[PDB]
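User: I'm putting together a teaching handout on how multi-component assemblies are represented. Below are the sequence lines for each component of a complex, exactly as they appear in our records. Could you produce the 3D structure of the whole assembly as C-alpha cells, so the students can see both representations side by side? Please keep the chain order the same as the input.
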Amino acid sequence: VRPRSDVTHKQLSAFGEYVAEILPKYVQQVQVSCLDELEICIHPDGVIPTLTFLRDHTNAQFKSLADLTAVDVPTRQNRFEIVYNLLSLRFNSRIRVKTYADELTPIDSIVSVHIAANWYEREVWDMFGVFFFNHPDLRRILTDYGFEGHPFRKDFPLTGYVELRYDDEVKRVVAEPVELAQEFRKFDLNSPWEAFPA
Amino acid sequence: HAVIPHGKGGRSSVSGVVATVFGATGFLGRYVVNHLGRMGSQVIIPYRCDVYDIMHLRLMGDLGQLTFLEWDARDKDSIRKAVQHSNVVINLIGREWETRNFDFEDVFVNIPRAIAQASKEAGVERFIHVSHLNASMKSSSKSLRSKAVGEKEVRSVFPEAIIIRPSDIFGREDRFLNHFANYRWFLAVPLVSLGFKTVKQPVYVADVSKGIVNATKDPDAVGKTFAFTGPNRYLLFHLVKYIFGMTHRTFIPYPLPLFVYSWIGKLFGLSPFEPWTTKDKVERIHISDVMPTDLPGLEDLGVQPTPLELKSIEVLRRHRTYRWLSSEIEETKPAKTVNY
Amino acid sequence: LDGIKDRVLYVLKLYDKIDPEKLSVNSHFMKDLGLDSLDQVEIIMAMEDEFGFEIPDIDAEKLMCPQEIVDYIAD
Amino acid sequence: TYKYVNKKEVDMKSATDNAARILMWTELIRGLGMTLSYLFREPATINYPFEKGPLSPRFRGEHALRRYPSGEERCIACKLCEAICPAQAITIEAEPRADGSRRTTRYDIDMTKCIYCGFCQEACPVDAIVEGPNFEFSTETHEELLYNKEKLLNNGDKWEAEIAANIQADYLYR
Amino acid sequence: TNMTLNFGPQHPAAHGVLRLVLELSGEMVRKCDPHIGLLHRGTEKLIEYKTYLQALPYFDRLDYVSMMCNEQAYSIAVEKLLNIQPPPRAQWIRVLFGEITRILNHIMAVTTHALDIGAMTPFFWMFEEREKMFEFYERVSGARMHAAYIRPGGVHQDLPLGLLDDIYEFSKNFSLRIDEVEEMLTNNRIWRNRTVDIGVVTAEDALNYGFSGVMLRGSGIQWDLRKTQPYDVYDQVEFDVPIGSRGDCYDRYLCRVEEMRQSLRIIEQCLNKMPPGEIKVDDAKVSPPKRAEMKTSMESLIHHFKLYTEGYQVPPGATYTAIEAPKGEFGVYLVSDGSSRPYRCKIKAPGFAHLAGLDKMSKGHMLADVVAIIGTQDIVFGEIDR
Amino acid sequence: RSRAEYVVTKLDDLINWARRSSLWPMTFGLACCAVEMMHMAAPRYDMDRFGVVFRASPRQADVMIVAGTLTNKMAPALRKVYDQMPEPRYVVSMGSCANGGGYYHYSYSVVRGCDRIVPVDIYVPGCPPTAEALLYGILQLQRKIKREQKLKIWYRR
Amino acid sequence: TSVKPIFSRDLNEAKRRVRELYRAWYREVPNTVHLMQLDITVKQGRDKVREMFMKNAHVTDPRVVDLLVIKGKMELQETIKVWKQRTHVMRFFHETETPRPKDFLSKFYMGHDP
Ligand SMILES: CCCCCCCCCCCCCCCCCC(=O)OC[C@H](COP(=O)(O)OCCN)OC(=O)CCCCCCCCCCCCCCCCC
Ligand SMILES: NC(=O)C1=CN([C@@H]2O[C@H](COP(=O)(O)OP(=O)(O)OC[C@H]3O[C@@H](n4cnc5c(N)ncnc54)[C@H](OP(=O)(O)O)[C@@H]3O)[C@@H](O)[C@H]2O)C=CC1
Ligand SMILES: COC1=C(OC)C(=O)C(CC=C(C)C)=C(C)C1=O
Ligand code: SF4
Ligand code: SF4
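Assistant: Of course. Below is the structure of the complete assembly, with chains in the same order as your input.
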C-alpha cells in the first residue's frame, strides 16, 4: 500500500474548487485523482486563459510546463486529449490541465504562456496531427523529412508503410512499401476474467 | 523442381529463380544481380575477385538470397559445384583486354563452353549466354570474331540456350560513354574518319539487365538470339561531342589513320595494368553498328529502351569540371540522330 | 499597346497544352479553352516572366482573357 | 539544505600574488604536474587476448539451450520464453515427439533482434534457455547470427560446464 | 543565410545525431535551429504493444548514460498505478544505484564536455572509474549497462554477497579522482575562459523554457525534486543541493562536480544504513514468484505463468511521476487502461526542453561557443528523440 | 626464392600487415553502443594499444563502427559518410540495434540493420555489445584483413 | 455540420491559398532541380507538382483543404533550405518499384489478394 498523505488529497482538492470558481468558464470535471494529483479539465477555448491564470496568479504560481502530450482515444469523438502537466516551484505542487481536440479542430498554442511548449507542440503535430494556431514555427520535430502520416495515432501501423534500403541501380537510398520478414507477432493478452473492482 | 512464387514483389519475397551468374562482378553483372535480387530470386554469384571487391553486391540481395562461391575458370570442378543447385545459368564472362594467362579465345569461348556443358550435366532449365553485337567469324576484331565462334559452340554443349547479343552498353561505369569522356586528359580526341561512318546505337545498361532478367522468367525465349540495341542510333561524331558537351569540355575531333591508331591501342595494350585502350577495342569502336536483323530484344522481351540523352547526365556528371556540374541536360543541346 | 498583345499571344501558344491554333484574344482560359484552374495559374505566371512584372495573387483570378491581361499589363 | 558552488581587499600582497598568477602562468604549471604524476602511475589496461576483463556469474552474454544430465533437452516448449521476449526474437513451433513427450521442432533466437535482456533466462520454468557466459561470437555474415535449435543446443553442450557452475552460484539469489 | 552551415551529425562534437543548422556571419552564430529525430526510434509507440515488464528494457535505452535512474521513473510510475510500494531494502538499493548512476552520468557529462573543448586526459582518467562502476552494474544485474535491474516492484535480485564492500572501496577513493580532474580543469586558466559567461540563462527564463535540471539550479533557482518531492528513500538521506550563481557554463559545471561529491555522501549513507529484508514486493500479483516457490507450489507456478505470459494488469488510471534523473526531471506520463499493456507513455526527457534553449542561450556566439553549450546541457539524443 | 608467386604473397602480406596494424576508426555514435566504445578507447581496454586511433574524420578513417540505431532520417547520412571514405574501407556493425533492428526492429523509423545501407564486414552482437566484445570484433576484422590476398589475385588474373 | 473554421470560411476563400501555394511550388521546382542536382526535368518536376495538387482535387470541405496547404507549405520550406536532400525529393518521383497493375488479369496472375 502506497503511503498516501490525506493532507495532500484535501489541499489539492480545495485548489481544484478554487480554480473552478475562479474560471467557471472553460473548466469542467475538476477532479483529484486517488494519486494525490489534480487534473482540471478545460474546454479547448480555455487553453490560453486557464494556463495564464496558473502561470501568473499569486495563490497558484505554475511557472514551468513539465509536458504537453496527446493521448488518442479513437472512440472519443474528439480523438486527441491534449494533456499539459505544470509544476509550482513555490508551492511544491503539480497540476494537469487536459483539453480535447479532434483531428481538424486546432487548439490554441501556449508558446506565449510558456515557451517550453514551442517544441512539444511541434512534437504533438508531428505524431498526432493536432494543429496549434499562432505557433511560431510548426514543423516536424521527430519524423523523417518526407514522412507521410502521423505516427503515434492509434490508427497508424507500427511498422508503418515505408522502409528504406540502398539501391545500386539508382545509387541512392529508396523507400519501398514495407515488407517485413517476421511480422510482429500480435499476442492477445487480455484475460477473459476481470478483477472485482476493490 | 521449382519454387512457387509467393510475396508482393519486393525484397523479402520469393520468385523461384535460383541462378548461377559467373561474371556478376561486372558492370553489366552488377545490374543483373540488382534486378534478380529485387525480384527475390535465389542468386549464386561465383567469384574469383577478392571478398572486399564482392561486398558491393551483398546489400541489394535480401538475407539468404545471395550466395557467393569461390571459382577458377581453369578448374572445371569449381563450375561443377556452382551449378549443382541452380536451375538458371547466366554467362557474362568477357574481358576486352587479353590478359597474360587468359587469352581472348579462352575467356570468350573456352570458359563458356565448359560452363554450358556443366549445367546440361546439372540439368539447369535454361542457360543465357551473352556475346557482343555484330559478331562474325570473319569480322574485324578478334574479340568479336571469337565471341562469334563461341555462340556456336555453346549451342552444341547446351541446345536451345538463349543468346542475347547486346550492343556496346550505355551506363554509369560503362566504357562506351566514359571512355570518350575521359579523352579529356588527351588534349586532342582522335576519331578515325573524324568520327564518321561508324554509326552506333547505345543501349542503357538497365534495359539490358531487365531484358536479361525477363528472359530468365519467360518461356518464349529458347534458342532465341535477341539483340538489345537502343532507342536511337548515332554517328560517332555527335556522340563524342555530345559527351564532351555534357562534360562541358572542349572538343577537337582529329582525324588519325586507324592504321596508325591500331598502333596506339597496341601501346596502351602493352601496359600491364588494365590497358585503357585495346587494339581490339579500337577496331570495335570504329566497327559500325549492325542494323537490327536478329531477334528483337528490348520491347520484345518487355522493356522499352531508354534514350541516351535521358540518363547521360548521370553517367557523365563526374567527368564534368568544378563548375557546370549543376548544368542539367535540357538547357544543354541534345545531338542529332543519324539512322543511316 | 498592341505589342503587349503580340507578347501575350506568343506566351499562350508556347506552353503547348493550350491554343492549338484556337488562340483568340476574346478566348477565356476557363470559359472556352477548358484549361484547368491551375493551368491558368501557370499561364499568368508565364506572362509575368516575359513581361518582367509579377501580377498579384487575386487579379490573376479576374483575367482569363489574353486581351484583358494586355489591358492590365498596359496599366 | 543548499550550497553555493561559486558565490563571491586589493592588497599588494594580494595583487602581486594575483599578477604573478597571470604573468608566470602559475596555475597552468599546476595542471602539468598532475599529468606528469600519472605518467608515473601503473597503466590500467589489460592484454585483451591474454588477460580478460572480469565478468561475474549473472553476465548474460550469449544464448544457449541446456540439456538434462541424462541427455534429454530441457526445453518442453511451453513457449512463454517467446511470450516474454521484448524484441520478438525467439520463434518456437512444437509438435509431440514420437516418444509422446512435448519438444520444440524449431527454436530460433534471432540474436540481431535479441537485446540480451535476460528475461528468457528468468521466464523458463525448466530453465532450458540460459544466458551463457560467452560474449565473443562476432560473425562475418548476418545469417550466422540467426541461431536455430541445433546451434543453441551445440552452444549449450560446449558451455554446459560453466553454465552449470554459473547457475549453481546464482540460484539461491533468484 | 550567413553561410549557413549544418553542424555534423557524425561530428565528434554532439552526441552523434545533432544536425544543427546554423547561419553564421563569419564566426558568429546568428541563429541555431537544432534538428531532431535523427534517433527517433518509436520508443513511445512500441511500448503500447508491449506488457509492463517487457517495456522496462525500453526505459534503460531512453537515456542510457543514465541507465537505471530512468528505470526508477517507470518503476515508480507503475507502482503508483498499482498502489504498491517496494520493500525497504529495494528502496535503498534504488537510491544506492540511483546515485552511482548519477556519478556515471556526470563523469560522462564533464569529461565528454572537455573532449569537445579539447581537454582529453580527464575523459581517460574518469572512464577508468566509470569502468569500475559498470562492474557493479554487471555484478548486480548481469549487464554492464542496460541492466533491467530496477523493475516495477522493487529490484530484481538481491545484491551479490560482497558488492556493498566494493561499492565502498571505490567510493572511499573516487573523491581523489574528482579532485584530480579539478586540478586540471576547475581553475585552468583556459577552461574558465571558454566556459565562463557563455550561455548565461536568467532565472525567470530558465523556468519559462522548462529547463528543470542543473540548468535551473545553475541559475540559482533552488529545486531538486529529490528534496522537494522525495521519491523512494531519498528522504531518509541527507545531501546538499549544489545551487549556483552567475549561471554560465562554468558555474553549472561546478554544480555537476558538486553533485558528484554530494552523491558520494548519499552512497556512503546507503552502504551504512541498508536494511535486512526482501528486494521485491511480496504480492505475487505484481512481482514474479521466487523460482524455488514456482517449482514447488501450484499457486506460484500459476502466478509465474500468468505474470510472464500476460502481465500485471494495472488498474485503469494515469500518472505523471518525475524523479531527478542526472540530466534533470525525467517523468513518465503513463496512461493505463485495465489491460496488462500500457495505453500511452510519454517520456518527458530532460533534454527536449534543454535543446530548445540552445537558441536562446547561444546568441551572438562563435562556432566554438555552440560546442561548449551542447556540452553544458548533457544532451543524450536518446531521451530527446525517444 | 624468386618465383614471383612467392614474392607476391610476401608483398601482399606486408600490405595486409600495414592496414591490419593501423586501423583508424570513426564512430558515428548513434545511440548508446557508443558509450561502450568510448570504454574501449578508455584505459581498461585501450584501443590505441592495438593501433586503433581513438578518433578519425571520414577522409582518414579505415573502418566505420556503426553503433546504435540507424534511424530512417540518419540512413541517408550513414551512406554519405561511408561513401566519403578511402578505397580500402570497412564497416563493423556494433549493437543488436544496428546488426539487425534490435528492440526497435518493428518501428517505422528504424532501418532494420545497417547492412541494408552499408555493406557490413563484422557484426558485433549484444544490446550494449561488451567493449571486450567490440575489441574481439575489431581483432576479427584484423584476421579478415590478414587473409585478404589482393595482389595474388592480380598476379593470377 | 456546424464546424468551426480553421482557415477559410468557405471553399472559394481557400482555393485562393491552394493556388498561391501552387504559384510558390511552380517557381520552386526549377531551383531545386539545380541545387539538388536531380536527374529530373524542370517540366517533369512541375508535372509532379500538378499531380499532387490534383490528387487531392476531390476534397470539398474547407477545413480539410486548409490543413492540406498547411502541410504543403512546410513541405516546400523543407524542400527549400535543402533540408530534404536528393533522396527525400526523388522519392516523390517513385523509382525502383514495379508499378503494381490494376488489370484483373494482372492481379489474378500475381498476388493472392487484390
Ligand atoms: C630590469 C628588468 C627588466 C625586465 C622586466 C621583466 C619583468 C618580469 C617579466 C614580466 C613578464 C613575465 C611573463 C611573460 C610571459 C607571460 C605573458 C603573459 O601575460 O601571458 C599571456 C597569458 C595571460 O593569461 P590570461 O589570463 O589569458 O590573460 C590575463 C590578462 N588578459 O598567459 C597564457 O595564456 C599562457 C598560455 C600558455 C599555454 C601553454 C602553457 C605551457 C606551459 C609550460 C611551458 C612554459 C614555458 C616553458 C619555457 C621553456 C624554455 C623556453
Ligand atoms: N560493357 C561492354 O563493353 C559490353 C559487354 N558485352 C558483353 O557482356 C559481358 C559483360 O560485360 P561487362 O560487365 O562490361 O564485362 P566486364 O569487363 O565487367 O567483365 C565481366 C565479368 O567477367 C569476369 N571475368 C573476366 N575474365 C575472366 C576470367 N578469365 N575468368 C573468370 N572470370 C572472368 C570478370 O570478373 P573479375 O573482373 O572479377 O575477374 C567480370 O566480373 C561481357 O562478357 C561482354 O562480352 C556486350 C556488349 C557491350
Ligand atoms: C554519445 O555521443 C557521442 C559522442 O559525443 C558525446 C562522441 O563524441 C562519440 C565519438 C567517440 C569516440 C569513441 C570516437 C560518440 C561515439 C558518440 O556517440
Ligand atoms: S521457456 Fe524454457 S522451456 Fe519453455 S520453451 Fe522457452 S525455453 Fe523451452
Ligand atoms: S543495441 Fe542495445 S545498446 Fe546498441 S543501440 Fe540498440 S539498444 Fe542501445
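A couple of points students might notice: Helices of chain C lie at 2-14, 29-33, 37-51, 59-62, 66-74. The pocket of NDP (ligand 2) is lined by residues B 23, 25-29, 48-49, 73, 92-95, 102, 107, 111, 130, 132, 166, 168-169, 174-175; F 157 (CB under 6 Å).
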